[PDB]
C-alpha cells in the first residue's frame, strides 16, 4: 500500500505520517531528515523554539524531493505571539523556503493570553500566501472556542500529546466535530514505557511480525490521526515508516483502547509558559 494522505478542512492535503524533529544538533537533524526523505517521509515537522530550522532547511536543499512534494511544518514560539509576521519570516529564512505548508502556534500560554493576537496575525499571513494552512498545538477545547468565537477562523490541525496511555477521546471528538484534524505528538508515549510491554501490544506485535512501535503507529493511523513520531536514529526512522502493509482490526483497536489512563507525560497546556 501507499502512504496515506489526509485532506484538511481548508482543502489542503497532508501526509498522515511525518517525521518530528526536536531539540537535536544540526548533525542529527540533517542526517535524520536525509534518512526519512530517502525511506519515503514527505512530511517534516519542526519548530522555531528548537533552534535547528537552519539545519532542516539545509537538509531540504540537499534532498532531491521537490519542494511542492514536501509538507513542511514549523511553529510560532511562545514569546512571539504578538509578532507572528516577524517570527514566520525569520523561520522561512532559516528554512530557506518561500512559504510553509502548515504554521502552528506552539502553545496557547493562557497565562499571557496573547494567543488570539497570534491567530489573527496568522490569519493575515495566510491570506498573503506565506502559509498554506494554519493550526495550533496543545490547544484545549476552551482555547479553540475562544479562537472561533473571536475570529470565525477554525484551525485545520490541533497537534496534541496523544498515545495509548492518554488517548484524548474527548478532545479528539471535539476536534473532529469542528472539522479540526487531530495530530499526535509523542505518539509512542515517549519510549513505550507502560505500552510496548503490554500483553495487547506484544501479541499484536507477534501476530503481525511488527515492532511494538510499529503496532502503536498503525493504531494512530487506523484511528484516523495524523501522526508525528520523533526520532534521529536511522534504523528507527525507517522502522516507524514501515506500517503500510497491515491494518488493525476493529476488535484489535478496541483492545488497545483499554490502555487509556489519561496519563499526560509532557508539559501541561493550561500551565506551560505561565
From Swiss-Prot:
Keywords: Cytoplasm, NADP, Oxidoreductase
pH dependence: Optimum pH is 7.5.
Subcellular location: Cytoplasm
Active-site residue numbers: 50 (proton donor)
Coiled coil: none
Domain of life of the organism encoding this protein: Bacteria
GO cellular component: cytosol
One family name in Pfam for this protein: Aldo_ket_red
Intrachain S-S bonds: none
Family affiliation: Belongs to the aldo/keto reductase family.
Protein name from the UniProt record: Methylglyoxal reductase DkgA
Protein species of origin: Escherichia coli (strain K12)
